Design brief:
unknown function; two-stranded antiparallel sheet; 5 strands; alpha+beta; monomer; 3-stranded antiparallel sheet; 25% strand; Ubiquitin-like (UB roll); 108 residues
Amino acid sequence: SMFGGSLKVYGGEIVPTRPYVSILAEINENADRILGAALEKYGLEHSKDDFILVEVSNDDDRKSMSDLREIDGRPIPPTECPLFEMTARSGNGENGFDSFLAIKRKPH
C-alpha cells in the first residue's frame, strides 16, 4: 500500500461539473491546507469560511440514505489534521483510510 501524497477529494455539492478532484497533501498538514488546496482547485479559496472538510465513510449509505452523493460525515475544521486518524487505521469505513475526505458547506 502507499500513502500516495494525493487525496481524492469530492466537492460535487459545490461544483457538480467537477465532483472529484485530486489534491496534494501530507499527513502532517491541517485541514486548512487540505481544504485550501482543494478549494484553490475550484478557485474559491477566498470563500473558505463557507466550507469545511468532512470525513465520509464509504459505507455511510447504510446510516443515511443520502449516500455519498450529498456527503455526510464528521465536521473537520481547518485547524484539525484528519489524516492522522485516517492513515492510522487505514481501513474500515468509519474512522480510517477507507473513508475519504470531502468538502461540505460549513453553514447550513
